[model samples]
Target chain A: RRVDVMDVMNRLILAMDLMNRDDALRVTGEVREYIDTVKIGYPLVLSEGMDIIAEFRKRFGCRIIADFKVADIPETNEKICRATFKAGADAIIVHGFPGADSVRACLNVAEEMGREVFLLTEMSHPGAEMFIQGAADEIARMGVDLGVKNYVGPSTRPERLSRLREIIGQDSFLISPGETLRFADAIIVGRSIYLADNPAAAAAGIIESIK
Target chain B: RRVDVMDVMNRLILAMDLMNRDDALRVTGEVREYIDTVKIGYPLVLSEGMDIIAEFRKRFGCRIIADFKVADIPETNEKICRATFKAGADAIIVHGFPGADSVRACLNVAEEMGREVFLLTEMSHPGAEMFIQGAADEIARMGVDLGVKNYVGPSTRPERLSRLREIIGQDSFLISPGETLRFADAIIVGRSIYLADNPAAAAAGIIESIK
Candidate 1:
């Protein structure tokens, strides 16, 4: 089983309980739009509300997630996985390169909750070159073997997608974001389109480009 | 002459016409909170609605203020000051070190609204040491000579407060904040008190310690 909405709920509850309530309410509307696989942003999730996972479920539907880039002990990570799955997240993100045990523990928790999990092989920062080339392929391979079947990568790199396909063999879902061009899968855009002159058009262009 | 509510509203409407409605709403709340001279924070302004100023005005009657840290040039700053006053702010904050022209512009604006302009000298952040210690006294002296009545200093260091009192000589409103032991005439605390287990108790403690 993979991680799912319950995991997101657990994490969101964990994060929201730590801060101001009003701040929690601020992001509820925005995060509600993203329920398929919660793309956890490290700083933003910490800075804003984590509880948005539950809010998303309450407002939208289930299939929520906690997007914390989990990278810890199989046992410890397993605990978060269980709690998140119980809470309502449909998926949880774990560091893809943290050995097979880590992925195994996450998978065990997801199996318990009947949820899904994704492997983060590449990050979306402009400064992502430090890790992606050497590490992404290794993690994508692990994800494929582990049967996690979903991977996170930068949309800008078709070469990486090709490499991932070579390893994972087109069976997994790829979530691509960052300096993604017209040829990527499931682009997650922000300021580029959010602050653009016409965000709807930009979003459509991105969707078309990815297709 | 002083910035007031009407002026802030006018600018808000103009900004709304130019920016998105949500962005414009954000600005209105910011400008409105600055008029509420107590508990200055960007998050409170950004997250909470402007209705808070009205709440304070109803409670405090004629003494409500927007303490938005009004800093700008002679003409532009004067316009903001006037806008703040019209919006019902009883006082505004302007940096003391901007020069005589800036000081004069604030005074002129304040006089127009029958309100007061408080000069910010030292802030709570550590980097404030770069300027305040040497120049605060000079500006305070200028303010005294010019009959300007209010000055701001954060209460993080009571010793600094004593030093400020030593230089400014006790004739005007020493508007300040810090983790003080007693309450003075006015106290400006942000995270320190607001984050306490009991905000009311924290506020009471702060008011008690600021003398």
Candidate 2:
């Protein structure tokens, strides 16, 4: 019943978790031909600036998913999404644990800005078992109840992931983190590509394997 | 029971939820003498830069609680904490909904960086009623189980606040967002102060009323 979550905002995403701008840009540049969609998060965004999203788009023509894990009250979530979408993120990821209204705030902003929201139902960490595991079904139901069409769940647990998919159903897009032939339409290869000796080759290998 | 969440990382905090640098700094400065500890979040930080934390400290010698509501996988949480602490946050707020391990990951970084972590038990919002209200007590108990000393809950529900206080006991610090004389040792006043005609006087009035 435990799992991890990610956004299917843009498929074949290279989760650019590298915190330094130079290193991130370089590794991204190395893998540019392979991935046009990169997930930039607080590690890099907070370290560099929100402009990093646009920078990725400009230099690599990448679609940036601001993996902010937006967790806050309704008002604050609205501001966070506005700040993110305004900074040029194509889509954003948010936690469903805060309940319906908080997620709705993010959804409202995304809709307003012509952007998208990927609801994170469960995370991939062990601690996610403490609560997220037990609540994934309810959270997915919550997302469906709210008319969410995109989601992020864990690839670690097959049954749980399938359950998430079943609950969310075929119509919704499900993103499985770091896809290892996961059920999701597209795959995300983070450290495997970014941390490899030759990131370009790493990216090529994953694409070939998935093919 | 239902409530909102905030960090008591700094007592008598000014929850500076303003998203603009000029406006935020001006309003914060207006209340500078009245308050020294300010709670800042992604709204302003992402808008300006992470350096905004240092900027607040340099200009006002304020203790900033980065209310990120850190809700991510353990590894990402670690990186977020490292980034925030590196940017000069005295403490950061994290969501407990992600579970104990994620919260522990944050606590570990805070311990290593010599900062603090405030676990957000419940939030104050209508949507929070769906899930957070039902889980506040367990979330509080989860924090205590994880050995967390700082907590955030809502002020809208007196019995819930008291129950949270009772769970964490009088020994821990509980931050009630925008205090209307809530039971926590300290109070946070956000829009009430920032949106007031006289922000400085607004801060002073809140302080006087609490007295």
Candidate 3:
């Protein structure tokens, strides 16, 4: 029952955080052969435009994950999802912390458009411990109840990632479970790849290490 | 310790949720005298592009709140805030559910850029009860401890709004406190104003009701 929407290549996905379009495009192109799925967040999308999604699709032929972390009321959440899907994104990442209604809004639109929604249960940050960690388990459970087939778990915590896997079960596709490849379908590498001297080689090196 | 960052006129701020650039411009222009501050969320910004902030400022001479519920890791949160302030936004909204690190990232950038950050504690939706409600008071306390002077409280719930006020105290500028106008520095009227047949009259009428 594993729902396969985003076919991440080489068990690796690039979190393209560079804001400059030229730099972003150049770095991503250099690693084109190593990565087929690129995660583009608001840093690039809001800086450049939603048009970047279509351009990335046309040029590199990569599946784009619009990492919007969409956390808004139901009305606005639907609009954000609709616009991202229309922008040619393969799938969009949403924030589970916003509650079921907000996530549901994105899920409904994503389902209608034949796209996918990846719920971010626990973020990998020192501050996330303040509130998100306490709610992470319940958030993942909420995703399961809402029929979320994809998830983004904290890469820094193996204990929490295992708990997340238990909640979502084996049918769901999990991403960013560092050191636990068995628990994650795809791994996200951001600064290490995007900021390296040779991004292409960096990507290749990471894939080789994981393999 | 009231921080007068956004001087919302008539104690009523317009949540310009319309997607079209021309339509958004026209509607805001229609209600120009009624409002001096407009909360421009991702719906319009993502649709027309970030340049719309400068355009709205140039034409309307109004303050813009980039209601970007920034919920990401610390690294990317900083980038999103940097790009948003660069786009001519007077203030931006950050979600407290992500934890102190994410909120800290935004607060640091806002202070450096001489802009402001509005911490969105609770959202106005039935689904927000699933999780955000349980965390609302704690989220407000987190915002207060982080020195966040402005907040977006749940508009439909007075009990929670009062609890939020207790957490943040009387000095904080809270918005959307439903019937308890005493607790809110300004009110947010979205669909009721923007979706009205006569937007100008609708905005004026709301102001009159408050007065």
Candidate 4:
């Protein structure tokens, strides 16, 4: 009934999570530490392919998540989750806006496939701001009520983070992007490290920034 | 250089070509015929994405293509095709083997919106080959070879078809899955039609076979 969903579009998600849990752990050995935070997203999975995940485990270890946002008719989405889990991902994501039945089906398939489910409340793009600014609270709660352990939103302000932390509950996980420190249970940093001159160090800074 | 590098992603590349061609005719008149085809992939300027493609084009026919293969590198791959064209697409597919270029760049953005890229090779099961075999000659000749087109090599014997066709001449176009006369150029029909009640008629009454 209670699940934690992570939105890791890349290994960066788990790298930070690793840095958070154990200060001594090198993010290079990071795959094993993702259980608590981060989700490996589809792009990363597709880019890296599952072999990278295998290396992630070999290099970092498993139990960390690869967040694959899956949404489709029951049979199809379930198959998607199955393939992802077969690839060794710990969780898959689904959209809350797709309506309750679809969401329920996603959750059920995730349950059947033994993968975690994180639900999207509000995305990080600037355009999402207009539509979800007013309704994010309801959506976040809707995600919560549905037993989705991880709730995703783009709350750049501390107040929004605090509100989110409160709405979803401190215990409930928050996957936020762009904001540093205080709010995000997990943050997705793409170009920040993806385009960085020194990716590992950039990753280190993000991990250190989060309290 | 003005080659609309954006088309690398080939998003509306299919639609754009179709529309441009239609304009040379009485495109303003055949609204209904145009709507049905464009509804799927009329390729008319207006029929790029959703209902708009269906409503506007006065005379257009849909061409739902299955092989959504349009490959390229990062700076061009992700945004090129889809970004260049704004028209609605009845369908657009993608290949799985474009390497990190397609995976990292192309679908990275597409995933958020839940657009499924059909990937280069799929399966009824294992060891199914695909359409890329003969694409090399065509792509090489163009000198813009990135291996992007929409065709699936038959699963039973993929090499067989490529061997039969030998080369996919640049101007040549083929459609997979459906075999409705293939009035377009050529048709590669799968099991359903082949195994149907009338095998001879299924091949559109090959005059040679009848003789």
Best candidate, lDDT: 3
**Best-matching candidate per DockQ:** 3
DockQ of candidates 1 onward, in order? Answer: 0.01, 0.77, 0.85, 0.04
Put the candidates in lDDT order, highest first.
3, 2, 1, 4
Tens-digit per-residue lDDT, A18-105, candidate 3: 8999999999999999999999999999889999999999999999999998988898999999999999998888888778999999
TM-score of chain A of each: 0.70, 0.92, 0.96, 0.70
Ranking by DockQ: 3, 2, 4, 1
DockQ, candidate 3, vs. native dimer: 0.85
In model 2, what is the error at residue A79, expressed in angstroms?
1.0
Over the stretch B8-95, how does candidate 2's per-residue lDDT look in tens digits?
A: 3234689888888999999988888878889998889988999999999999988899999998888999999999999999899999
Q: What DockQ does candidate 4 score?
A: 0.04
Ten consecutive residues with minimal summed lDDT in candidate 1 chain A?
Answer: A10-19
Per model, state how many residue pairs clash: 61, 8, 0, 39
- What does candidate 1's lDDT look like per residue over B1-211, in tens digits? 1222222211111111111224423433333422233432212222333344444456533244454444333554565566456556667666654455667788897887788777766655432443344556666766776677677665667887877777666555565553342323455444443344554454445445432
Give the per-residue lDDT of model 2 (tens digit) for A14-79: 889999899999999887777777888898998888898888889987778888888788888999
TM-score of each: 0.40, 0.93, 0.96, 0.46
Candidate 3: Cα lDDT at A91: 87
Alpha-carbon shift of residue A151 in model 3 (angstroms): 0.7
Give a tens-digit lDDT track for model 3, residues B1-211. 2555456888888999999998899899999998999999999988899999999999999999989999988878999999999999999999988889889999999999999999999887878877788888888888888999889988666777788888888878888823768778898888898888999999999888988
lDDT of 1 at A199: 43
Between candidates 3 and 4, the one scoring higher on TM-score is 3
- Model 3 chain B, poorest ten-residue lDDT window? B1-10
